[PDB]
Amino acid sequence: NKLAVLYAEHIATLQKRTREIIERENLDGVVFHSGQAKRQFLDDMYYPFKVNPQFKAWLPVIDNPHCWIVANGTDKPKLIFYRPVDFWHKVEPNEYWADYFDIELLVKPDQVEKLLPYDKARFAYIGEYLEVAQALGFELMNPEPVMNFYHYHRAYKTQYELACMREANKIAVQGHKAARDAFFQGKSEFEIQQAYLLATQHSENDTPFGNYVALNENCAILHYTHFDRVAPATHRSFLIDAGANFNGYAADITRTYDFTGEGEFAELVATMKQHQIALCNQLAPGKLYGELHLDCHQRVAQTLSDFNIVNLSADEIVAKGITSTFFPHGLGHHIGLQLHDVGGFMADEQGAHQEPGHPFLRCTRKIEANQVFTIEPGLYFIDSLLGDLAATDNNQHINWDKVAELKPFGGIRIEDNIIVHEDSLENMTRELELD
């Protein structure tokens, strides 16, 4: 396995990071709890299992509750692997990552008693279940200096992590091309989603987030969760925000399409595409991410002017803050183990927070090598926001006829995942030839 080579360096890095923080916080070690299955109210059914990000940060075990990692950075990390024995289900770790842990099998969740350290006074519990931690004897639960430290360095992806994210993007792109074909065949939102799921070989709960699969006016809906079962009478626009998972690492890709490939909306999409590519290539070590977000508002304003959506020059559109009506979210975010990855705001290991008139900007941190970003500029026609704009004194400056013409197409978003290197950029998505 070519992943195994990189995974050895991955463990050594996590061990190194663990050594530092437990010595800085005077701890014996850190305990990572994979998590638990949540039971539905008054029912014997369970919610789908979601693994603790801090747990899967160590190893690709993401579908197994009641697992525990005990690490101090010097000894080999101890893996308490849950493996029940009853005829109701079907199951020993055999993959390359197993050899880097001291594995002890747990046949029953409550038996974790005797496998955890006896003196837990200086062992930090990192997990969601504080009452379970209390029942075990842990009193140090999710201490902020430890949380902030790990979250800070999570931004710096190891070579193993980059490999996993490249693979995640490979899978996602395959899905996006299948979803694209389904759209031009005139399928419904539901049918398009199904085509995506089949092509990625992902179940719905495997994706890093509930995919957004939108047609026509629904393209304006940022968090569009529902899928229409019936195809629209006329096909105008298509927006799919969908990703994939590989070993716990996420991909997050958006593409917008015009059905006919010509007309005002098709040109608008093409314009946003060139803006999106230009914004991607502005990523560089030393740059604050906030500068890119600002440049995006500049480009959205320019776009509004050129297509005569707003009857003003680009800079007055910026100054009046009209751009926020059409582009109300952030340009992008860190991505990795979590979709919206941690540490996006922090300036140091101690958790120095850097804030963004742009409340929904998710990244303000200085860009460095081995960090991974999304770049997702957008231009939408949302009724609530357009109504607010009409209530302002900027009413007279808006081409409402133009807005009416473009409204049935919903909106535009184009998203890529980019690895920043020392002297180059790696746009994983477009290098996989997703136009």
Binding site for Mn ion (CB under 5 A): 28, 241, 252, 254, 374, 415
Kindly state the smallest distance separating residue 101's Cβ from its own copies, in Å.
Answer: 22
CA distance 397 to 310: 6
- Chain residues 99-138 in contact with Ba ion, contact rule CB under 5 A: none
Q: Which does 375 bind (CB under 5 to 8 A by kind): its own copies, Ba ion, Mn ion, none?
A: none
Applying CB under 8 A, the residues found at the interface with its own copies are 35, 38, 40-45, 47-48, 50, 52-54, 85-90, 127-128, 190-191, 193-194, 197-198, 201, 203-205, 208-210, 218, 221-227, 229, 328, 338-340, 342, 382, 384-385
241 has binding-site annotation: yes
Question: For residue 82, which amino acid is it?
Answer: Y
83 binds, among its own copies, Ba ion, Mn ion, none (CB under 5 to 8 A by kind): none
Cβ nearer to Ba ion, comparing 72 with 303: 72
Residue 77 binding partner per list Mn ion, Ba ion, its own copies, none, with a CB distance cut-off of 5 to 8 Å that depends on partner kind: none
> Residue 194 CB, nearest distance to its own copies (Å)?
5
Burial label, 401 (beta-carbon count in 10 A; 0-12, 13-18, 19+):
exposed
Q: Which is nearer to Ba ion, 26 or 203 (CB)?
A: 26
Q: What string of DSSP letters covers 321-382?
A: TTHHHH--S-S--B-SSSSS-TTSSBSSTT--B-----TT----SBP-TTEEEEE--EEE--
Q: In whole angstroms, how close is the CB of 60 to Mn ion at the nearest point? A: 21
Cβ distance to Mn ion smaller for residue 6 or 105: 6
Could you tell me if 222 and 210 are in contact, meaning their C-beta atoms sit under 8 angstroms apart? no
- 102 labeled binding residue: no
Q: Is 340 annotated as a binding residue?
A: no
416-427 b/e with 16+ CB inside 10 Å = b? bbbbbeeeeebb
Segment 12 to 71, residues that bind Ba ion, using CB under 5 A: 26, 28
As a whole number of angstroms, the distance between CA 381 and CA 401 comes to 13
226 is in an annotated binding site: no
Nearer to its own copies, 314 or 344 (CB): 344
Using CA atoms, how far apart are residues 331 and 61, in angstroms rounded to an integer?
31
Nearest approach, Cβ of 374 to Mn ion (angstroms)? 4
DSSP 93-129: --SGGGGGSEEEEESSGGGGGGTS-S--TTEEEESS-
Q: Which residue's CB is nearer to Mn ion, number 204 or number 388?
A: 204
- For residue 69, the minimal CB distance to Ba ion (Å) is 19
β-strand 411-413 against 378-380: which pairing, if any?
Answer: antiparallel
Is 206 assigned to a binding site? Answer: no
**Angle ∠(374,378,381) on CA atoms, nearest 5:** 155
Alpha-carbon distances, residue 40 vs 1, 43, 46, 127, 196 (angstroms): 40, 5, 5, 20, 29
Count of residues near Ba ion by CB under 5 A: 2
Contact between 343 and 269 (Cβ < 8 Å): no
Choose the contact partner of 54 out of Ba ion, Mn ion, its own copies, none; CB within 5 to 8 A by kind: its own copies
* 29, containing H or E segment: strand 29-33
Minimum CB–partner distance for residue 329 and its own copies (Å): 9
Separation of alpha carbons 377 and 170, rounded Å: 22
Which entry of Mn ion, Ba ion, its own copies, none binds 374, CB below 5 to 8 A by partner kind? Mn ion
Among its own copies, Mn ion, Ba ion, none, partner that 404 touches (CB below 5 to 8 angstroms by kind): none
Helices (H) and strands (E) in the chain, counts: 13, 14
| DSSP structure string for 211-245 | -EEEEGGGGG-TT-----SS--SS--EEEEEEEEE
Letters for 259-298 (x = contact with Ba ion by CB under 5 A, - = none) are ----------------------------------------
Q: Which does 20 bind (CB under 5 to 8 A by kind): Ba ion, Mn ion, its own copies, none?
A: none
Q: Which is nearer to Ba ion, 120 or 157 (CB)?
A: 120
**241 interface partner picked from Mn ion, Ba ion, its own copies, none, CB below 5 to 8 A per type:** Mn ion
Tokens representing residue 315 in the block: 């800079």
Residues paired with residue 140 on neighbouring β-strands, in sequence order: 124
- Binding residues (CB under 5 A) for Ba ion: these are 26, 28
Binding-site positions for Mn(2+) read 241, 252, 333, 376, 415
Binding-site positions read 241, 252, 333, 376, 415
